[PDB]
Amino acid sequence: SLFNDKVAKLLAGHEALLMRKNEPVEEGNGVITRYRYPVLTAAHTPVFWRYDLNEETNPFLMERIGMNATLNAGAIKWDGKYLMLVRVEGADRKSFFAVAESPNGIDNFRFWEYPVTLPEDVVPATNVYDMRLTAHEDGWIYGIFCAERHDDNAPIGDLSSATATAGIARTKDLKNWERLPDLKTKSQQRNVVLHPEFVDGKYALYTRPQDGFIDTGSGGGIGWALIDDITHAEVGEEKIIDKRYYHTIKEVKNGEGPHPIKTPQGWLHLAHGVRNCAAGLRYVLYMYMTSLDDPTRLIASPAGYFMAPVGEERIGDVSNVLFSNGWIADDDGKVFIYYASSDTRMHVATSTIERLVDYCLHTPQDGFSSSASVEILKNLIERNLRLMK
């Protein structure tokens, strides 16, 4: 029948998309390798999420539930597989979480047949997004995410005013999730992330205090807060670890991405930085390192951005954005960086622990001015010209 043939073709096209082999992009900077294809797009969502496959109830075979975007994904190595904890945004503009797995980390990602069922905390949330997974030493996998609600305290007609809180959930199988109380804090929070080890016997959070829903205001950067009880999480003291700076890629806002990777040289961090331009907000990725002895102490601040939008990455629902809240480091040192472009699709970039540490340690620090940048550059040129002669 024509209908059954159409269903068969939908499924066949979907399998071909899912199984497509990724290929590295040859041209790169020696730090990271980009890949030709995204690891996930809205088109990667299962056919059976979007279409009613029953001819009786969907004789035209049209989509019943449109899928808009697959973005800002957490990540974890799980039972030998490479997992993303994907933020999937429907055509209805709500996001939900969904696990996708790959045998190799760069292609053949496939969504688990059901997305994540996440219980509400005591106050219901309208949207949930951007989960960071932490396999904590306490034996749980934590997902720290943004729980967003309308702010009724707004002028009449204002349906955009919102509040962001840090949601906390944990699981041991990524299917059954326990929702803990939202983080209690004196400011709005987004980009909260759980450090994987106890520090002074306490849970440690990366935080990002902000005066408003979109603007940080007095919020000084990426914060650090020790928490006595993750099941009744409340910030007491909050210390800024990585600061915003005028005329850097992290001027207006910044935030921790995934939880950092432990290296012999220190904690290796991946974050985003924001500045304003004539086209709106521009988001890039950057890195920093902190001490093993004192994870609050910066020990490497390579100047500028680590990755910024290239090519197809530049365009999407929210253009001029890269964002990451997930990466995986294998035992052999290979690193898989899962980053979204333009709030629309997920990509992978690969590197190694040794290369990322080399990048952090030997990319000169920002001296904060054009004159300083020129002096750093002239010094390198002088070395190279001597060598090339």
Ligand X SMILES: OC[C@H]1O[C@@H](O)[C@H](O)[C@@H](O)[C@@H]1O
Touching ligand X, residues 180-239 (CB under 6 A): 214
Q: CB nearer to a second copy: give 107 or 256.
A: 107
CA torsion sign for 89, 350, 300, 248 is negative
| Degrees to nearest 5, angle at CA 43 with 321 and 41 | 25
Q: CB nearer to ligand X: give 156 or 278.
A: 278
Residues 6+ apart with CB under 8 A from 248: 273, 275, 304, 366, 368
Residues 6+ apart with CB under 8 A from 247: 368
Q: CB nearer to ligand X: give 129 or 286.
A: 129
| Degrees to nearest 5, angle at CA 190 with 188 and 193 | 125
Of 354, 359, 360, 195, nearest to 289 by C-alpha is 360
Q: CB of 31: closest distance to a second copy in angstroms?
A: 5
Q: CB nearer to ligand BMA: give 266 or 316.
A: 316
**Under rule CB under 6 A, which residues in 329-368 are in contact with ligand X?**
none
Q: CB nearer to ligand X: give 90 or 364.
A: 90
CA pair distance 213, 238, nearest whole angstrom? 19
> Judged by CB under 6 A, which of 82, 111, 129, 145 binds ligand X?
129
Considering just the CA atoms, what is the radius of gyration of the chain in Å? 22
Choices 174-182, 232-240, 277-285, 301-309; region in contact with ligand BMA by CB under 6 A:
277-285
Q: CB of 272: closest distance to a second copy in angstroms?
A: 12
> Judged by CB under 6 A, which of 14, 50, 190, 269 binds ligand BMA?
190
Question: Does the footprint of ligand BMA cover residue 199 (CB under 6 A)?
Answer: no
Choices 227-235, 317-325, 331-339, 347-355; region in contact with ligand BMA by CB under 6 A:
317-325
Q: CB of 59: closest distance to ligand X in angstroms?
A: 35
**Three-class DSSP category at 321:** strand
Find the largest Cα–Cα distance for the chain: 77
| Contact in structure between 321 and 346 (CB atoms under 8 Å) | no
Q: CB nearer to ligand X: give 22 or 325.
A: 325
Q: CB nearer to ligand X: give 320 or 351.
A: 320
> Judged by CB under 6 A, which of 109, 111, 129, 145 binds ligand BMA?
129
Q: CB of 137: closest distance to a second copy in angstroms?
A: 30
Binding-residue total with ligand X (CB under 6 A): 3
Question: Does the footprint of ligand X cover residue 288 (CB under 6 A)?
Answer: no
Task: Tell me the CA distances in angstroms from 109 to 20, 35, 316, 347, 363, one per residue in order.
Answer: 10, 14, 21, 11, 33
Question: Does the footprint of ligand BMA cover residue 275 (CB under 6 A)?
Answer: no
Residue 323 contact, options ligand BMA, ligand X, a second copy, none, Cβ 5-8 Å cut-off depending on partner type = ligand BMA
CA pair distance 110, 98, nearest whole angstrom? 10
Q: CB nearer to ligand X: give 146 or 168.
A: 146
> What long-range pairs does 170-173 form, CB within 8 A, spacing at least 24?
170/140, 170/141, 170/142, 170/143, 171/140, 171/141, 171/143, 172/139, 172/140, 172/141
Q: CB of 16: closest distance to a second copy in angstroms?
A: 4
**Three-class DSSP category at 131:** strand
How far, in whole angstroms, is CA 388 from its chain's centroid? 41
Binding site for ligand BMA (CB under 6 A): 72, 129-130, 190, 277-278, 283, 318, 321, 323, 343
Binding site for ligand X (CB under 6 A): 129, 214, 278
